[PDB]
RNA sequence: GAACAGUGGUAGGAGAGCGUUCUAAGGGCUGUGAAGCCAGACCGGAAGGACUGGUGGAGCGCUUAGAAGUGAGAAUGCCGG
RNA sequence: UUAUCCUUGGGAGUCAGACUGCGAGUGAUAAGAUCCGUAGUCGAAAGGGAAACAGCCCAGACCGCCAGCUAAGGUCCCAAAG
RNA sequence: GACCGAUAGUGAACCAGUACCGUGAGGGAAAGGUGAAAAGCACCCCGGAAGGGGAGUGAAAGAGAUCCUGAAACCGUGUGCCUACAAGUAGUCAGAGCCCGUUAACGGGUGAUGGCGUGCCUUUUGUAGAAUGAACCGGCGAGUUACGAUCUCGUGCAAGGU
């Protein structure tokens, strides 16, 4: 079994026990998460949303908050003497996926 | 500067043909033994502030002390003998552990004498105050005489 | 004429790939022992195909 | 993340037999660079070869439409001065016909080293008998 | 006051500007004089009126 | 175990001894001071003497059997230059480098 | 009082060095050269980003084709169905599903079929 | 804190900061190892800042304020290598 | 409907412009010519297209994303899509 | 002494107006640091010596005179990954394989192969530029100060201020 969820502005295929990494939610560490657009469940009973699967819902609890290794964003524009630097750590949600709710 | 630096007169090669980059003197400044441009040259520092404001910053510095309970006036200040002993001991009585700013009346030779070797204290006639010694001194002492003293002037 | 660029630590090692000795043309002297050239007396104790030279 | 990539491990090929007699000469090796690339598979890798082998018979009865026959020259260049050289399409197909499918595919197929390495897979006979029978290949027809 | 924990009255004194270091600053290089002619040189411009 | 000799700021130039030293590195003590004997370069002297002070080390201070050892390293370093100069035509003089050579050799059991 | 150049000036070029590690030669080695090149790492990376994802979409787009091709689509005419049928489910799914279960993109292209021949 | 809007940029204007040496006042660190130097996969939006280990063998941070010989990649720059 | 505008004061930089389209002159109704007028872009503007290509077409880069929709231009292969 | 600390500060911390240059007037350098103490390495060994290896001294000798620290360029030795069909502003993003194991992080090294990609600076209408500058590394090297003027901000006092 594995579903296809949309979290962030993005999707993202889950099995049960996964531990994936997506945009910030509003949680905390211990929090259980629930993802209510589920796009496609896949395995045995193959579930085909339109858009979504009605009623499906993935769990899952959040390990940690964080932020990602840092990128040095650097920019030049040459005999022209502009430079830019600017450092960025994109934030993330660590979660680990308990159960598919098809 | 470059015209103070010994020697560099002439010109160290001709302007044109050898190569090298044009140079007028070898002391001009990115020579090494050069001429520095624009460092220190001996000045003064000082300014007056107007004679009001000067009032009122030692006001400010005495009356803050009086709020932070740091000032002690002394009925009178009178050592028989000019010694450091006595004084060490006069300031252990009065709970001066840290820095003392102490000021008499006029000139006091013992009391002067006595505290001039202990690291910290200061003795100052009442003209003498001012406010860095104040604010750098964390007690105050100050004869009674000396109090009669500075409000004649300051007020 | 003159280098255009300054040549790389990189293709001076390259160029220097043949600039190398060899081994000495050697053999052991059936006499003494020591090596020794190949078609050359022998240098330690004189001896040439077996025959004392320097006597 | 998660965008599966093949590789030497991975990558499974297949042996094709593709027949030339008939076709014309661009639009068969359209589809046979094509497929020399990998682009028929799902598990496409851009860096690395996901093609299979294609084997093409009866290279010398490729068709050419207008006249090109007569009118398609194919040059080349020595390199020495005045060193241009010529073929016309007929001389070609009569005498090179494997180099005329092979310059054709050639040009079809990406320009350095994994392009190269991919060429590689193609075999053009003159005749209608290849030699490899030992790879068991499919006969493989071509789409539109 | 205590000489420990001076602190001047907001807005009376600023930071000098210091041309000439670099590009960050918005002042390297030409050091806000523009690009050459008499009002760049050092000494430079014509005398006032 | 190893015994380690060095002759510091020999002069001759650090390119000219490693030639030499590229031939020995690695060779059994024996062999190598046969290929120093037989090769006509002005370092084979001076590195065979290196060798031969290290071998003695071997010996004396370490009582390792000098018929077992093998240069283990053997590499050149560049000394200190000592600066000349050269007249050349019109007025100009030019610089030559005197070039000196740390020379090292380490020997150890088989 | 007197500034000395002191340390400053070897900790920031230092710091540039660092980041010139396994570049090529001189590159990691001397620092007017390694800061060109870290300066211009940074605009390619900066650039690289932002085709990164180009790139991605269309490596996917092409599995797709290649899979919809295989149920006897183009990947226009695929993905015209899946829009008609309400499918959401992006790219990056898709392609992942041509590749690892292709029976689930079978369904997904028949749903497809279904839409494209009404 | 919310919403809404905005954030390419040369000359150039404006703002906010980083770091350097020195001073004053707090407060500290250091032969149980200071500064400097070397290394590292750490931290900050940048300038930059730590931590750990090695070398080193005696000095040095921190806070607030002050003062400047205060920051280099280019000058066919100067000196040395 | 939109948020500019004016005054006073502090501080500038600029006074070599370029091409493109359109309206003129000069020229031969030549010039990537020259000189005005007018709009744009470059200058001081990265991204996509025009093979490559300051000035043309599309379009304005605060950062991150292995999400999506489109512009010009495209969809046999190189090369994404008929 | 909110002056310098050996490229600084005198040209000169040192046997410097020396050496050196010039017919001459004249020009004019470089060059500080063993250790608390010489306790400055008896003796043995290789070597003609230089120089080493031990042994001693010492807190330390990788403090042994070219003696505090000991950066970079530059020169070597060893070897984990890669490399002899390849077209390279040398990176960047994608990426197997192999080798590792950290300030424990959606780690480190290397990099087959794929995409993209004409250094930096100056000066220009416009420069990858077949324009200019820099061999490299290091150090040093450019809006300052005084006195006046004016504006903003701050503070004191205010028809007064000094
Ligand atoms: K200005
Ligand atoms: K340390
Ligand atoms: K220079
Ligand atoms: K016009
Ligand atoms: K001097
Ligand atoms: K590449
Ligand atoms: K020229
Ligand atoms: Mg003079
Ligand atoms: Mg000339
Ligand atoms: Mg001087
Ligand atoms: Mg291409
Ligand atoms: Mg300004
Ligand atoms: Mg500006
Ligand atoms: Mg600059
Ligand atoms: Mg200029
Ligand atoms: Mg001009
Ligand atoms: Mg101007
Ligand atoms: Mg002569
Ligand atoms: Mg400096
Ligand atoms: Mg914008
Ligand atoms: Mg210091
Ligand atoms: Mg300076
Ligand atoms: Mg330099
Ligand atoms: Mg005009
Ligand atoms: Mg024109
Ligand atoms: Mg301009
Ligand atoms: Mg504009
Ligand atoms: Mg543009
Ligand atoms: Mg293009
Ligand atoms: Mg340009
Ligand atoms: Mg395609
Ligand atoms: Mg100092
Ligand atoms: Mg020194
Ligand atoms: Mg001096
Ligand atoms: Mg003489
Ligand atoms: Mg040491
Ligand atoms: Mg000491
Ligand atoms: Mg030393
Ligand atoms: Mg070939
Ligand atoms: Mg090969
Ligand atoms: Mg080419
Ligand atoms: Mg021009
Ligand atoms: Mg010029
Ligand atoms: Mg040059
Ligand atoms: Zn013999």
């Keep these: 079994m594995y579903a296809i969820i949309k979290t962030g502005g993005k999707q993202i295929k889950v099995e049960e026990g996964q531990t994936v990494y997506i945009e910030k939610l509003?949680?905390?560490?211990?929090?259980?998460?629930?993802?209510?657009?589920?796009?496609?469940?896949?395995?045995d009973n193959v579930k085909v949303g339109n858009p979504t699967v009605e009623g499906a819902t993935v769990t899952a609890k959040v390990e940690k908050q964080g932020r990602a290794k840092k990128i040095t964003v650097f920019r030049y524009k040459p005999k022209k003497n502009v430079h830019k630097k600017q450092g960025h750590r994109q934030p993330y949600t660590k979660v680990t996926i308990e159960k598919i709710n098809a | 500067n470059r015209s103070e630096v010994r020697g560099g007169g002439r010109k160290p090669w001709r302007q044109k043909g050898t190569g090298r980059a044009r140079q007028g003197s070898i002391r001009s400044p990115q020579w090494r033994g050069g001429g520095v441009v624009f460092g220190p040259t001996p000045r003064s520092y000082s300014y007056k502030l107007p004679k009001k404001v000067r009032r009122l910053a030692i006001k400010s510095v005495l009356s803050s002390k009086v709020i932070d309970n740091n000032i002690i006036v002394l009925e009178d200040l009178t050592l028989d003998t000019a010694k450091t002993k006595e004084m060490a001991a006069i300031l252990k009585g009065l709970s001066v552990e840290k820095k003392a700013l102490i000021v008499?009346?006029?000139?006091?030779?013992?009391?002067?004498?006595?505290?001039?070797?202990?690291?910290?204290?200061?003795?100052?006639?009442?003209?003498?105050?001012?406010?860095?010694?104040?604010?750098?001194?964390?007690?105050?002492?100050?004869?009674?005489?000396?109090?009669?003293?500075?409000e004649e002037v300051l007020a | 004429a003159v280098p255009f660029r300054r040549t790389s630590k990189m293709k001076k090692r390259l160029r220097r790939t043949h600039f190398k000795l060899n081994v000495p043309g050697m053999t052991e002297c059936p006499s003494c022992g020591e090596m020794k050239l190949s078609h050359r007396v022998c240098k330690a104790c004189g001896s040439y195909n077996g025959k004392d030279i320097n006597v | 993340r998660t965008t599966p990539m093949a590789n030497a491990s991975t990558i499974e090929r297949k042996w094709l037999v593709v027949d030339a007699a008939g076709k014309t000469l661009g639009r068969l090796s359209s589809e046979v660079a094509a497929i020399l690339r990998g682009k028929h598979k799902p598990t496409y890798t851009p860096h690395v070869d996901?093609?299979?082998?294609?084997?093409?018979?009866?290279?010398?009865?490729?068709?050419?439409?207008?006249?090109?026959?007569?009118?398609?020259?194919?040059?080349?260049?020595?390199?020495?001065?005045?060193?241009?050289?010529?073929?016309?399409?007929?001389?070609?197909?009569?005498?090179?016909?494997?180099?005329?499918?092979?310059?054709?595919?050639?040009?079809?197929?990406?320009?350095?080293?994994?392009?190269?390495?991919?060429?590689?897979?193609?075999?053009?006979?003159r005749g209608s008998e290849h030699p490899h029978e030992a790879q068991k290949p499919e006969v493989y027809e071509l789409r539109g | 006051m205590k000489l420990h924990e001076l602190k001047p009255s907001e807005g009376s004194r600023k930071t000098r500007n210091r041309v000439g270091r670099g590009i960050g600053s918005g002042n390297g290089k030409t050091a806000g004089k523009g690009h050459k002619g008499q009002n760049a040189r050092s000494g430079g411009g014509v005398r006032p009126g | 175990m190893q015994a380690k000799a060095v002759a510091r700021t020999?002069?001759?130039?650090?390119?000219?001894?490693?030639?030499?030293?590229?031939?020995?590195?690695?060779?059994?003590?024996?062999?190598?001071?046969?290929?120093?004997?037989?090769?006509?370069?002005?370092?084979?002297?001076?590195?065979?003497?290196?060798?031969?002070?290290?071998?003695?080390?071997?010996?004396?201070?370490?009582?390792?059997?000098?018929?077992?050892?093998?240069?283990?390293?053997?590499?050149?370093?560049?000394?200190?230059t000592l600066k000349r100069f050269r007249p050349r035509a019109m007025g100009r003089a030019s610089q030559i480098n005197k070039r000196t050579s740390h020379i090292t050799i380490v020997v150890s059991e088989k | 009082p007197r500034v000395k150049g002191g340390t400053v000036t070897r900790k920031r070029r230092k710091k540039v060095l660092k980041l010139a590690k396994g570049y090529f030669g001189s590159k990691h080695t001397l620092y007017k050269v390694a800061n060109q090149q870290v300066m211009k790492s940074g605009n390619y990376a900066f650039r690289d980003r932002r085709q990164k994802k180009r790139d991605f979409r269309k490596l996917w787009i092409t599995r797709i084709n290649a899979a919809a091709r295989m149920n006897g689509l183009s990947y226009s005419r695929l993905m015209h169905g899946l829009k008609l049928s309400g499918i959401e489910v992006n790219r990056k799914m898709l392609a992942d599903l041509a590749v690892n279960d292709l029976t689930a993109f079978n369904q997904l292209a028949d749903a497809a079929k279904a839409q494209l021949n009404k």
């Design chain 4, 50 to 125: 996901t093609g299979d082998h294609v084997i093409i018979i009866n290279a010398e009865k490729i068709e050419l439409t207008g006249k090109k026959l007569t009118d398609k020259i194919y040059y080349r260049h020595t390199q020495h001065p005045g060193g241009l050289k010529s073929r016309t399409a007929l001389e070609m197909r009569t005498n090179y016909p494997e180099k005329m499918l092979e310059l054709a595919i050639k040009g079809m197929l990406p320009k350095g080293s994994l392009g190269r390495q991919m060429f590689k897979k193609l075999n053009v006979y």
């Design chain 2, 104 to 150: 008499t009346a006029d000139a006091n030779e013992a009391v002067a004498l006595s505290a001039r070797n202990i690291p910290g204290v200061t003795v100052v006639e009442a003209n003498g105050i001012n406010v860095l010694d104040v604010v750098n001194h964390e007690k105050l002492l100050i004869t009674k005489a000396a109090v009669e003293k500075v």
């Design chain 1, 26 to 43: 509003a949680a905390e560490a211990g929090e259980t998460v629930t993802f209510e657009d589920v796009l496609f469940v896949g395995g």
């Design chain 6, 10 to 80: 020999v002069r001759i130039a650090p390119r000219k001894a490693r030639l030499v030293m590229d031939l020995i590195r690695g060779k059994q003590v024996g062999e190598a001071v046969s290929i120093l004997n037989l090769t006509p370069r002005a370092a084979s002297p001076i590195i065979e003497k290196v060798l031969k002070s290290a071998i003695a080390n071997a010996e004396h201070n370490y009582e390792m059997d000098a018929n077992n050892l093998v240069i283990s390293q053997a590499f050149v370093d560049e000394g200190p």
